[PDB]
Design an enzyme around this catalytic site. Sequence first.
Site, PDB file in Angstrom:
ATOM      1  N   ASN A   1      -9.994  -3.138   3.183  1.00  0.00           N
ATOM      2  CA  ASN A   1      -9.572  -2.940   1.483  1.00  0.00           C
ATOM      3  C   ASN A   1     -10.940  -2.542   0.769  1.00  0.00           C
ATOM      4  O   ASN A   1     -12.047  -2.680   1.521  1.00  0.00           O
ATOM      5  CB  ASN A   1      -8.969  -4.279   1.036  1.00  0.00           C
TER       6      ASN A   1
ATOM      7  N   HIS B   1       0.989  -1.184  -0.044  1.00  0.00           N
ATOM      8  CA  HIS B   1      -0.052   0.060  -0.103  1.00  0.00           C
ATOM      9  C   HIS B   1       0.766   1.236   0.079  1.00  0.00           C
ATOM     10  O   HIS B   1       0.562   2.362   0.380  1.00  0.00           O
ATOM     11  CB  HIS B   1      -0.977  -0.017   1.074  1.00  0.00           C
TER      12      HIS B   1
HETATM   13  C1  HDD Z   1       1.135 -10.216   8.165  1.00  0.00           C
HETATM   14  C2  HDD Z   1       1.247  -9.056   7.205  1.00  0.00           C
HETATM   15  C3  HDD Z   1       0.077  -8.409   6.736  1.00  0.00           C
HETATM   16  C4  HDD Z   1      -1.206  -9.183   6.347  1.00  0.00           C
HETATM   17  C5  HDD Z   1      -1.667 -10.533   6.327  1.00  0.00           C
HETATM   18  C6  HDD Z   1      -1.932  -8.125   6.029  1.00  0.00           C
HETATM   19  N1  HDD Z   1      -1.313  -7.037   5.968  1.00  0.00           N
HETATM   20 FE1  HDD Z   1      -2.031  -4.961   5.619  1.00  0.00          FE
HETATM   21  N2  HDD Z   1      -0.294  -4.387   6.120  1.00  0.00           N
HETATM   22  C7  HDD Z   1       0.877  -4.914   6.592  1.00  0.00           C
HETATM   23  C8  HDD Z   1       1.167  -6.373   7.045  1.00  0.00           C
HETATM   24  C9  HDD Z   1      -0.045  -7.183   6.498  1.00  0.00           C
HETATM   25  C10 HDD Z   1       2.017  -3.898   6.887  1.00  0.00           C
HETATM   26  C11 HDD Z   1       3.420  -4.666   6.500  1.00  0.00           C
HETATM   27  O1  HDD Z   1       2.216  -4.103   8.341  1.00  0.00           O
HETATM   28  C12 HDD Z   1       1.724  -2.621   6.480  1.00  0.00           C
HETATM   29  C13 HDD Z   1       2.736  -1.914   5.492  1.00  0.00           C
HETATM   30  C14 HDD Z   1       2.619  -0.358   6.078  1.00  0.00           C
HETATM   31  C15 HDD Z   1       1.689  -0.568   7.649  1.00  0.00           C
HETATM   32  O2  HDD Z   1       1.697   0.145   8.313  1.00  0.00           O
HETATM   33  O3  HDD Z   1       1.354  -1.828   7.742  1.00  0.00           O
HETATM   34  C16 HDD Z   1       0.175  -2.965   5.739  1.00  0.00           C
HETATM   35  C17 HDD Z   1      -0.513  -1.952   5.315  1.00  0.00           C
HETATM   36  C18 HDD Z   1      -1.700  -2.217   4.923  1.00  0.00           C
HETATM   37  C19 HDD Z   1      -2.721  -0.901   4.574  1.00  0.00           C
HETATM   38  C20 HDD Z   1      -2.071   0.448   4.310  1.00  0.00           C
HETATM   39  C21 HDD Z   1      -2.593   1.266   5.647  1.00  0.00           C
HETATM   40  C22 HDD Z   1      -2.163   2.680   5.141  1.00  0.00           C
HETATM   41  O4  HDD Z   1      -2.976   3.303   4.233  1.00  0.00           O
HETATM   42  O5  HDD Z   1      -1.189   3.066   5.548  1.00  0.00           O
HETATM   43  C23 HDD Z   1      -4.061  -1.489   4.134  1.00  0.00           C
HETATM   44  C24 HDD Z   1      -5.207  -0.803   3.733  1.00  0.00           C
HETATM   45  C25 HDD Z   1      -3.789  -2.754   4.561  1.00  0.00           C
HETATM   46  N3  HDD Z   1      -2.526  -3.362   4.942  1.00  0.00           N
HETATM   47  C26 HDD Z   1      -5.090  -3.548   4.781  1.00  0.00           C
HETATM   48  C27 HDD Z   1      -4.883  -5.201   4.831  1.00  0.00           C
HETATM   49  C28 HDD Z   1      -6.223  -6.216   4.762  1.00  0.00           C
HETATM   50  C29 HDD Z   1      -7.453  -5.240   4.381  1.00  0.00           C
HETATM   51  C30 HDD Z   1      -5.484  -7.206   5.206  1.00  0.00           C
HETATM   52  C31 HDD Z   1      -6.434  -8.402   4.962  1.00  0.00           C
HETATM   53  C32 HDD Z   1      -7.521  -8.570   5.648  1.00  0.00           C
HETATM   54  C33 HDD Z   1      -4.289  -7.212   5.273  1.00  0.00           C
HETATM   55  N4  HDD Z   1      -3.772  -5.813   5.065  1.00  0.00           N
HETATM   56  C34 HDD Z   1      -3.206  -8.092   5.810  1.00  0.00           C
END
Ligand code: HDD
Lengths: 318, 671, 673
Positions: free
Chosen positions: A134, A61
């Site tokens: 999402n 993202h």
């Molecule tokens: C185990 C790791 C993992 C899993 C399974 C997911 N994500 Fe995530 N997500 C992350 C690890 C992550 C992250 C690496 O931790 C991020 C990158 C930037 C942040 O703050 O967290 C992230 C970012 C991130 C953002 C951007 C937030 C922003 O605008 O700053 C969104 C909208 C989502 N994710 C949504 C989801 C949804 C709806 C998931 C499934 C239901 C999902 N993620 C599964």
Amino acid sequence: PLAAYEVDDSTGYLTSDVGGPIQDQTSLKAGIRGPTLLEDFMFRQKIQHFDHERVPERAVHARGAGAHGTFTSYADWSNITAASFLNATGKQTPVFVRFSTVAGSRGSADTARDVHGFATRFYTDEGNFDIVGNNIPVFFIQDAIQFPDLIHSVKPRPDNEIPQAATAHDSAWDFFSQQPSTMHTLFWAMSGHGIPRSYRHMDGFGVHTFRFVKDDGSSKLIKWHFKSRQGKASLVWEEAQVLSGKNADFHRQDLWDAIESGNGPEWDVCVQIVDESQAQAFGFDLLDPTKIIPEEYAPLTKLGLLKLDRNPTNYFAE
Amino acid sequence: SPLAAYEVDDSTGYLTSDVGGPIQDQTSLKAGIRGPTLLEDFMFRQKIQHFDHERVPERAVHARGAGAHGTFTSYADWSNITAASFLNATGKQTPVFVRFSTVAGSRGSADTARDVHGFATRFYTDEGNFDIVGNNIPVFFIQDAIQFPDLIHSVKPRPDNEIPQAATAHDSAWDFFSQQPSTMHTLFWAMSGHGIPRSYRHMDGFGVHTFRFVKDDGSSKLIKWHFKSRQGKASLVWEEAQVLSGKNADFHRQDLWDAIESGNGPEWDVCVQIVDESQAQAFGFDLLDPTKIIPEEYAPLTKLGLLKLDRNPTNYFAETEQVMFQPGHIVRGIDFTEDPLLQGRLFSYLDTQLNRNGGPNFEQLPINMPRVPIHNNNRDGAGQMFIHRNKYPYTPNTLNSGYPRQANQNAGRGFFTAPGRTASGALVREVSPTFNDHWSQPRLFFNSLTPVEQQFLVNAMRFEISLVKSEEVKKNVLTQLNRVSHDVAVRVAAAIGLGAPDADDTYYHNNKTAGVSIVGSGPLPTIKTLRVGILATTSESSALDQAAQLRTRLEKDGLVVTVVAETLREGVDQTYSTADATGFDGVVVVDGAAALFASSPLFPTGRPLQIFVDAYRWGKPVGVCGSEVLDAADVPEDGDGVYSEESVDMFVEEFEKGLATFRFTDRFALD
Amino acid sequence: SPLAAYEVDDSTGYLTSDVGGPIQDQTSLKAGIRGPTLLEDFMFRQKIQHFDHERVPERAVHARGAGAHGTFTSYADWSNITAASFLNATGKQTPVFVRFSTVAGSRGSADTARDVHGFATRFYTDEGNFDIVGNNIPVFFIQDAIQFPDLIHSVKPRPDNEIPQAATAHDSAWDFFSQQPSTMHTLFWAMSGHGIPRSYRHMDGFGVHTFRFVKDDGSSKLIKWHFKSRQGKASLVWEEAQVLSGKNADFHRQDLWDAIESGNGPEWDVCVQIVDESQAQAFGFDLLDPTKIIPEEYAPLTKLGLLKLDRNPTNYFAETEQVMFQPGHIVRGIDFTEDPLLQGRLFSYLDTQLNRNGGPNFEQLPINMPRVPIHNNNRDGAGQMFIHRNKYPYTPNTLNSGYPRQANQNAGRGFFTAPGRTASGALVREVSPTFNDHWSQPRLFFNSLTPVEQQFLVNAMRFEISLVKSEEVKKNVLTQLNRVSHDVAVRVAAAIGLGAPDADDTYYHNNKTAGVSIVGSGPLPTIKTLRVGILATTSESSALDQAAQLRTRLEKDGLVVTVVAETLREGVDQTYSTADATGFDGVVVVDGAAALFSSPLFPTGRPLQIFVDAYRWGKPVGVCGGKSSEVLDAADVPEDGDGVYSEESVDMFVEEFEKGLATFRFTDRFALD
Ligand code: HDD
Ligand code: HDD
Ligand code: HDD
Ligand SMILES: [Ca+2]
Ligand SMILES: [Ca+2]
Ligand SMILES: [Ca+2]
Ligand SMILES: [Ca+2]
Ligand SMILES: [Ca+2]
Ligand SMILES: [Ca+2]
């Protein structure tokens, strides 16, 4: 809402970060055609700051845009949840929302075909509460440990870093075909939901089943659904491809402009509510993030209004 | 090579942790089959922690780019002009790594943005790494390094909304250009086809600054570096570049990757202009001023050696993303000049790698390591990969017998500052009056372009300036353009409905210079790697037969042939759905396919004809092999770079001449 | 060295930059000989930037410590109890690295602070790195990892002024101990001689937690790790530790360095107590509770192998400072238990290395690398040193033919969780009532000490609690101490002018356990490396001759001899000005030097003070040569005292003195309540 941290530079003389008035247009030199001096602190503080401006992009993202707004509760929801921001009719809570794609880096195009993020912070009177959602209600995989597998496969091939912001390459389809859980989200991403007309014309989903917990300790199972008041709309693919070249900033510009014109976007913040006893009652497991509860089985309850009505002052800082 | 020693093979074996314990990584450890995940699941947390920390800050500028390995070979023993070891013998080979880039866009932005381009070369010499951190344009926007954040803030996206990506087509950029007249020369280059090169292989590299070559006897001369492409000079047209940005953001990196994989690694003659110290002000401008070129009429090029890129990276992140160039990576035989832009760069590149790497040992990354032993008293720091044996890391010492020993002009092949260099005068924050002519050289450049090339430049300015919202900024832009050329100001003003200011002839002149025009540089010296799209159909066996006949011939001539049809099958590479004119340097329709050019659920309405029409409009050689197609496309049969032959051999011969011509510029309207 | 591939030699050659360009680094580039320094001086900036960035954050705890390389050798094939590869054959050798430490002090604090000590061991096994991150005390202060920042904030310096360094002797620490009674057991250990060990070599190591040994067939047993010192148990006395902190803050790291350099590398028997899963609550306490020991009377030690440290590091920063231990570094054949202290540790040690290293690739530092290949899909990150050939780093894949393959119980020798483990019940933030007895085991420990050892412990508490300013905290401390022992509370209260509360006998008992007493552990099994100071004079050629004869006789037996005199010359190692009783395990005066017992060369009375301090602190002391009355009388040392020696014969003197060095401390010299 962040007024206390704002810095105004509409007047005044240039200063260092420690308030000493300085200049910043010519280096200090040993003679008019001479070498630059190490004692030029004006030079070094300015360039050191510039040299360190960047921070790592988000791991997923990375490409996205945000705005401030307000959430207003439609009722006192104490009878289903102890959540303070939901505890009175008309109760208002400030929000910040960021929308995004998933795969592309910073600077990739808004109109890539992708899953989109819809992340909402409620700055509640009993703490910040985030719904990190999402625009598609189901996820590709069934266990968080598989996330790096999914993301490595959809992101560019790691020898050449090709292709940007696209699932249209061997590794992504290798993963999809070897990991059949991906089929539901894949069908969504291949529909118009992969290329929404704007952030304002898509919905938001928490994806997971969560719990609402009353003060008496009783619980119910919920799904979050933010229902757009602007309607649902998509681009067509050939249009999205051209837009990616003609205006990579299409979605962020659309959102900025809607807010500046007094047409801030709105969503009904809704839940489906079901009993703990219904965890396996619908022919699938509510712990499985690849499944929706069909609306025929559990209707949406409208909890309140989310409106985005103020653009950020500094994109980086906010 | 440090790169070989650090290669990790995962073609066999069981999954392990980073400490070699065999593990699994597909299911979390849970309290029961439908239970919560356990904190004791170290397999989960090590894998996810790594993922969570994969990203590093992008480069502050030139974030978008791509790299390759190769070799530099010296043509001679250049001891007569420089002590540089990599230049000290005929045939001497030094490994290189080159990264090409844009400037303003972030790391996921399009290759075909209009921009200045980077061309950074590392020579892993036998007397240390030497970097020439250059651009594809020989002059820079500003005259003092302290102004770099001002320039870059103004061209990067506006900081309230972060709009627009990878573009100067916004108020702030043109505000800066119109207030800072030094920008005019580079601005004219960027608004020419040099802002939208056909590939990294079809652009030159320039050191920009005057440097010094220093001999072992201490004498010095002033030099400019120019890497001259052996592939020729070529540009996109603007509308093609815009479409490309959407259809293939990776166009330049793909082109480079593919050229190398096919055994068509790109080459440059590494050259210098060499002049005496006494000529610093002899050419009508100051050689310390990075906004000025030395016209080739005043100083010819000396060819020093051959640069060839012939190996792609194994891991993009480890090699391309982590390469950390510095103009401070200098070797004995080369020195700096008092160019105030160069002077400040020296500080920036050492500092910025702390941001990227997160620690001070970035020179230990395999891509940054030298190919000779390191002997110094640098110690500790995060990420320290060495185990130093010398327990007395201070100078002077007796307890380590005085080692490492000091190197200088007379010991250990030390670097030394050119000993004739001096400084004199007040300690000043003042600009030399010798830097004050900001307009004559932009005019020299403009004069040297062909008429259609001048039109393209005017049209680039019309495009961008029309997107500037501020009436005041637009008027200020015309004021500056007018100081270069009244005709340019008049023609640009016409698009924006403003009146150009009256002619101001202070800096007007009619002089021209060789070697700056793309359009005037003649046909390409090779057509190897150029792309031919053959538009065919699955509906006629004759069409596929014609396409196969064309392919055989074109491919032996080194062309990359793509046969396009409604659906994939044997002999067909691409569907109409995924094809676009931006994917080809020439387009051929086989005559069996005529009906497609007259609806299908397999591609968008009118796609086959649109490919041919776009290719024609963008100046490409186009043809029909085997009237109706040309009629539908409104393409004149008698047009230059339009081919129509029933004979395949005749067609191939003629079409190949068209590919070398590359663009048929008579298809563009002129003021 | 096991790390030879990473060594950089600078014994020859010309100075270069980090990219191999020969340079100089002694004078800045200036505009004229008295001019300003130039920005274009890259030699200056690369050198000073490196210097400016040399430091990394110290460890959040155990910041002060020192390490060494060695070898572990298995005594048997232990497949009957564990699948662990490093334990699978008699004589099998595995390289190790060990770091020892205090807990509370920062970098540069004194080795001889009163504290718990770390004993962290890495086994670089042929199936992955396995770390046992232990302490010299077998029980911990707290029962849940979430309380660690509370414990550590309370013992570290007060956060307004950052006072006091490396000490529990302040209000906040005793406030926490008195409010959190779980602390009593470790507190009693820390207040014993275990808080001030004689050296890292003279202390044991403990894993503290119950772990599991898991066989290849999936069956499991519960274990405790105990590394038993082959050098013996020995402590300093407190006053001696205080003087040492000032005279030699590096005492323990120096002792270890020197023992290794002299070919006296320290050894431990690596042992376990082994019990059945069914015995988790059979011993009168819960094996999940890290504040309890299993008395040896209930479960004997099984010796698994020998741990020997025999090679010092080449670069302290690169090896000792950068070693990043984790209890998450586990191998097939070992598993965790549900001890809530252990459970939370697993999270902390992976996370904290991000702070220390500044990036996620810390396992790539040479000291952290394994000695076997790595096959995984981890990538990128700051400081990535690998160039990965596999361009399809996801599972499941076909484009890399399904490699790397998953490893598990049945394939590829994977780690696996003990398959008999289960969980049941509510998801709760509740403490098990089985953890509630905080006082019986502290009393067991106290009962097991000798009378003078009990006195030393009381005296340590009297010292520290007298420095607590709050009278409420002092009262609260006595309330807790009283629940362990009324007598301890009365004796401590006496020093601080408070009354002890009335006896509360709920947890009192008279039971004892073997192997926890230092004073009762008998003579040292070896005297090699022990330090003998010989006090002589340059005034008398005969005194130097005596000292030389004694040196020869003592050195033959592996003692480290220091001859002290007014000034240095051949045969004299140290001047009186730099000499102190804390530098010796025994002190001998040669009778030719009797006249010394004022000068511009040392402080008034220094020679006698060395002898008197040595005697007061319990060390063997003596006079060699036949004439002893003058020295002994001046020192007020009785000529018939235990651990006091006088002989004309050098041979007869040394034979007696060496028995005294093995006895180590003459405890009859300390007053008792
Ligand atoms: C185990 C790791 C993992 C899993 C399974 C997911 N994500 Fe995530 N997500 C992350 C690890 C992550 C992250 C690496 O931790 C991020 C990158 C930037 C942040 O703050 O967290 C992230 C970012 C991130 C953002 C951007 C937030 C922003 O605008 O700053 C969104 C909208 C989502 N994710 C949504 C989801 C949804 C709806 C998931 C499934 C239901 C999902 N993620 C599964
Ligand atoms: C005072 C600051 C400053 C100034 C005046 C310049 N640059 Fe620069 N340049 C940087 C500060 C910088 C930087 C912030 O230090 C970067 C970002 C990443 C890096 O390693 O250095 C950089 C990156 C960078 C790269 C990318 C190297 C790569 O591929 O990794 C190129 C090709 C150039 N620059 C070329 C130039 C040229 C030809 C200049 C004028 C003649 C120039 N720079 C002026
Ligand atoms: C939840 C937090 C937490 C808890 C409950 C503990 N520790 Fe720990 N320990 C850390 C958090 C930590 C840490 C912050 O993660 C450190 C700092 C440096 C490091 O690598 O880990 C650490 C370092 C550390 C070291 C130094 C390793 C070295 O020499 O580098 C030792 C010997 C121990 N600890 C031993 C223990 C023992 C025997 C414990 C109880 C049985 C214990 N720790 C509980
Ligand atoms: Ca791929
Ligand atoms: Ca649609
Ligand atoms: Ca703007
Ligand atoms: Ca052109
Ligand atoms: Ca305190
Ligand atoms: Ca398992």
